[PDB]
Design a protein around this ligand. Sequence first.
Ligand SMILES: Nc1ncnc2c1ncn2[C@@H]1O[C@H](COP(=O)(O)OP(=O)(O)O)[C@@H](O)[C@H]1O
Ligand SMILES: [Mg+2]
Length: 311
Amino acid sequence: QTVSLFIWLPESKQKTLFISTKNHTQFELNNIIFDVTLSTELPDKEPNAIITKRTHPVGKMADEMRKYEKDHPKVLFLESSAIHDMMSSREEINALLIKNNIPIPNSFSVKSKEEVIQLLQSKQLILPFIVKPENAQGTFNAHQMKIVLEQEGIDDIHFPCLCQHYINHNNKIVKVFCIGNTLKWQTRTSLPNVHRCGIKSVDFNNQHLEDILSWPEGVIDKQDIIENSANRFGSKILEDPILLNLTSEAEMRDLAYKVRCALGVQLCGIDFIKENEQGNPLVVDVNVFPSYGGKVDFDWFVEKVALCYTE
Ligand SMILES: Nc1ncnc2c1ncn2[C@@H]1O[C@H](COP(=O)(O)OP(=O)(O)O)[C@@H](O)[C@H]1O
Ligand SMILES: [Mg+2]
C-alpha cells in the first residue's frame, strides 16, 4: 500500500523545526510506501494526511484550514482545527485534564475580579497563584503572565484567565515532546521559587524571561538571583530529567499516553513540574505541535509521523 503525507507549514515553522528540509521524500516503513511532501501551501491534490501547526487562531491559515477540512473529510489532520481550538483554551484543556484524573496545580477559569475574590474568600484559591490568559496560543499577549502574591495583587488582572496555584518547583521543568508514541524529553530551567515578602504581584512574559531581572527585591532569594542572572533567567537546558532523579522513562511515557488520550492529540508537548522536585508530576501546559527541542532531522520527523499514522 501507499500513503501520502503532506506537511503544511509556513517557512517560519520550517526554519525552527528542521535542521534542513526536503521538498519531497519517499521511504518504506512496515511494508508501506510513504510519499512525503513539504509545502507552505495546501495540497493541490488530496493526500491521506495533512501534518500542520496552525500559526495563529484567527487569520488566513485558520480560514483555509477549516474550509479544507470541511471539504475533504477523509484527510486526517495532525492536528485538526478542532484540536487547535480546544488546545488554545486554558479552560477547555484543564477541564479535560481534570476529567481524566491528570494532576495539575489547583486551577480555576475566571471571567472577573468578583469571581477571584469569592475563590480567595472561600479558601479554594490559595496564594500565590499564576494568572495565565484564557487564550493560550498565537500572540505575545497569550504568554503574558502575572504571579499574584497577596490578595491586593489581583487589581490589574487581565480577564478571562486561568488562575493556577503557584508551585515552588526549584526552577526545573520537564518537557516531554510526543509524535504519537515516540517521545523526546529534556529538563530546562523554569521560574524561581517565590517568596511572599509583601510585594503584591510580579509580571513576566514567557517569551521574555529577562523580565524577571526587574522583579522587586525579596520575591526571589538572593542566591537564586546569583545562579540565574548571567543567563537572564532564560529557559536553559539542564541535565536529563531521569539523570536528575526528577522522573523516570516509565513515568513520562505513562503521563504522555494519558494526556494524548485525554486531549485526543498526537503531536504535542507536555510541560510538568514537581513541588520541591518531589511527588506527582503537575502538568502546567500542553502545546499542540511543539518545537521538539528545536532543529530536528527532517527524515527522523517524517518517519516518526509515518509510524504514528500507522498506529
Ligand atoms: N502553576 C505554576 N507554578 C509555577 N510555575 C509555573 C506554573 N505554571 C507555569 N509556570 C512557569 O511559567 C512558565 C509559563 O507557563 P506555561 O503555562 O508553560 O505557558 P507558555 O504557554 O507560555 O509556555 C512555565 O514554563 C513555568 O516556568
Ligand atoms: Mg509552556
